[PDB]
Symmetry: C4
């Protein structure tokens, strides 16, 4: 067996120590754009998000209403692939053709959308999603450190080359990152076997090494493990380019689930992809996406300024991160 | 006094980090056979289990019905020795002659059975068990780091040579392993004075050193400390060849205890060997052994594939084990 | 990102190990004077407190009655600046002209008072406070590691030179201390992004380095994080010259808030500066300031003698501080 | 300030790892004698206890009935000095002249008794205690790292030389041990500012260094912090010669307090020396001392044999002590 010295930590065991704030660092001046897909040294990503938030590839969160509402604020949704190929493509088409502000829009001024895909029916599913207008694809899996991901990406590259953008994984260490990077993934999702903070720190380190070695920068996504807005700032500071959230978005008016009034409290349904529908429960109703996202990002921008950073890249180089003692928590 | 630097950890403080999964790694392809008794370099163990699970040497778990049901699935039971020599031998005989699938069977196609023995009446007890047809014996003790174990094994070797297989101990460090290894034990039980995970890791390390030094491989058994199926995978990954469980098997229809309906919930009786019958309580009734064991082992096989291993030996060399922070738990 | 090895600790994870107590170390002989403002090698601070306690710059704690009561015991209050410039100046004037024992008094035998100021209206506010008779000023901010603090101090030095004493900050590391030290702050407040004990230890270390480099000693203030009297002794031992407390003083008869009887228990109102009035709650009523402060300081003096120190400076050099294990707490 | 790297641990964070048990190690063969007072290389202590247990210098535990009952089993009590000199001397006299088995008896076959003394009235108190027949004296104090202890011991040595045995302290580190050792203390009490286990380990280390340097062996006493019988074995293994217990003995029929029946449960009164009578509560009634002590020591003897030791000195050299993880607890 191979053992690891330091134990892995969660986002709750960390704190950002303030840096120097200049007079020009005010929330309104903070830029939250981030690259969504890989590019090489000297270039910009073909797709850049206006806000570093993306919605999870789930039935209870990423539907057409969520996709439209999120794209309007600058983020992107990955319509769930846990439905028929015909239904998913229909949903993708619905978002693309909806029209007829930090809106994430394409050349034809249509909202951007991503779609989740699996390692089984990709041959039939990918073409349908591409035809429907999907802007980005992401292989949905809790453990993407497998041949199956390599094969799926390979088929896509053979059939479409670099025309089709495929995100992949859910790896927790540099070894898994490296494997998917070589396989051809446009961005890599982090999160499973390891505390979220350590996973991010380790993968980002490998990602940086890979960039110095190949000149190719692959954006990484922290998927889950975020319990508070502060954790959002921490994930980005540690090197994640954007964050994927499930429960956070399922509370909104736009999530596909039903609102349920349980003795005074209005809730929304929420179940996991691995549920027999994994969990099935409720999240407190929070209203419309816009107002909530705005509240969250305003707090992220302020924290960024406490760290003396006007952009995510600055935050990532300037951030002073410290571990907190168990007793302190 | 002699002090130790790192504190000992339990199985709950560890996590397996995924390795590369090949297309050929599917639960159905995973082989769970393990050696039960020592053998030397270039040979196979005389006895190999089909599944790495063995039932505890207890009154509330290892009876004749349990022995038959477990042997049928590929494991083995150690009939409790906390009864008369005549009763225990009768039970051994009952299992051996029951007949008249991963069944653990002998040359005459009879189910395999083990029996627990103590360091007191072995002179009268061993012969009776051997005559009755016992396939393996195990010295039952919570602290086997004593002269008494050496003496008992010695008597057996003098009287029967290597014809009779005796398991021994319950040691927690390499020093105790080494002592019992030299004494002649065919396999060594781990578990007491030390967190289960650390105990396993340390003994296995000594076991490996001993194998390189003598060419003799002695299988080790993690006895207790397993609270979940995942812990089963962890114990094997850390180097244990098979696991001994008590409470796990006492829930089944086949354990020797009484089913008790306590206001809606059907339970089964469970008491420790050191009880005044140690504890005396209840475990939730789980039904027949077969269905439960199958559920557990299916989850072990999947995890193994997440680690990219098709056999226990591969798991033991490929496993990437990390410690988890206190706060993460 | 920049990471830190050791995690930060709170005051609860520390213990003072006794030193040699001489026959001459009795509570009555302990001297609790401390410097409030910076001075250079070979000189005494222009202002020295008789007791190391100062009240927080809050609406629910630092009013005119509190200022008079605290100054009478040897400490000083910083009248809150979260009110109009006219009101705050009036309050300052009220304390200065109240007259017509470890009393902290000036040349004209008038009680000493401090006032909180912000980085916005200082141009209009500072002159009013100075004219009103304010003895010390302190920039109120949770994160003072910013250009805004430098600018405010700079304006004051340009307009008044070293005639006006300005405290600043709320930094948690040496880098923030250094910045405010160079900016011209007369004393620096510690406390936010980092466990209180570690913050104090790190800043004090920098403060000591700065003193050796420039010959200027800048007194530091531990603001908050003190839950018990013992923590008071710990903060001073670690190097803090004086302590700022909010909740502690809000319990007294002299705090500006209302006494409220809640089913048998008399409480006092307490709300944070960042409340929509931050929290709004109650603290148990404790009576008059005098009797409580006396009880607290008597316990500090005894502990000091257990450490064999008759003054704070001796405590700071003689203290033997140890970390306590998580389980011990 | 002086800081310490490793945090201090309690007895709950440790475990004894078994050693080799020989056939001759049975509880009945274990010898629990320990030296009570200092002696030099090549000699035996003038006073040796038959069991390593001594009762605390408290009003709720060490009275004449307790002293007689404990001496009969081989231990010794230190009659409380928190009473008049006349009362304490009377109690000492009562035990000495009571007569008219591991009994701790003197030359005249009278039970042995100790008495607590303070650093104030020793001039009047010591002579009275000596005249009354006190066999050993102990300076009662929670922090004995002071000039006052040196002075008291000095007076005694000047007046009586080495004829009168005085125990001293309550120190937690080697520095405090060293000070009292040089002052002339016959034995030193450990326990306060530091986790009990670490305190014992550190003082014992200093005690060993002192013995190698001077040839004088000073017995150390672990005072308090023992919550279970296992902790007793741990304290001795770590190097403490004997243990002082308060609550443990206050449960017995022989403690000086009142038995109180509180709705079905018979309790005994228990208050601390620093109580306004410190705490005042109840401990569960346990019956007569004999039966309880016997149960405790039988468990200590067995554990000793699991460590392969027939005497305390063997235990102290053979013990394999490991730290346990926070999560394991």
């Amino acid at each position: 067996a191979k053992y690891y010295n330091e134990p892995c930590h969660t986002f709750n065991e960390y704190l950002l120590i303030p840096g120097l704030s200049t007079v020009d660092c005010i929330p309104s001046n903070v830029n939250l754009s981030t690259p969504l897909v890989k590019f090489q040294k000297g270039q910009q990503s073909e797709i850049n998000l206006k806000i570093p938030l993306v919605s999870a590839i789930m039935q209870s969160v990423s539907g057409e209403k969520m996709a439209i509402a999120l794209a309007r604020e600058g983020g992107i949704s990955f319509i769930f692939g846990s439905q028929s190929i015909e239904s998913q493509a229909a949903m993708v088409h619905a978002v693309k053709n909806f029209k007829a502000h930090n809106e994430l829009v394409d050349s034809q001024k249509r909202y951007l959308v991503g779609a989740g895909i699996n390692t089984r029916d990709f041959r039939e599913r990918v073409p349908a999603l591409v035809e429907a207008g999907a802007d980005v694809l992401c292989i949905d899996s809790s453990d993407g450190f497998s041949e199956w991901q390599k094969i799926t990406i390979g088929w896509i590259r053979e059939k479409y080359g670099d025309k089709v953008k495929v995100g992949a994984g859910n790896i927790v260490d540099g070894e898994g990152f490296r494997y998917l990077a070589d396989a051809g993934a446009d961005f890599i999702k982090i999160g499973i076997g390891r505390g979220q903070a350590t996973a991010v720190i380790d993968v980002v380190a490998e990602r940086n090494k890979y960039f110095e070695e190949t000149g190719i920068y692959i954006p990484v996504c922290s998927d889950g493990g975020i319990v508070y807005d502060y954790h959002m700032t921490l994930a980005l500071a540690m090197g994640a380019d954007f964050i994927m959230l499930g429960r956070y978005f399922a509370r909104f008016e736009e999530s596909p689930t039903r609102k349920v009034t349980i003795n005074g409290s209005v809730m929304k349904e929420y179940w996991g992809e691995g549920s027999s529908r994994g969990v099935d429960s409720y999240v407190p109703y929070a209203g419309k996406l816009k107002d909530n996202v705005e509240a969250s990002l305003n707090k992220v921008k302020s924290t960024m300024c406490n760290c003396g950073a006007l952009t995510i890249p600055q935050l990532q180089s300037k951030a002073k991160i410290t571990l907190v003692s168990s007793v302190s928590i």
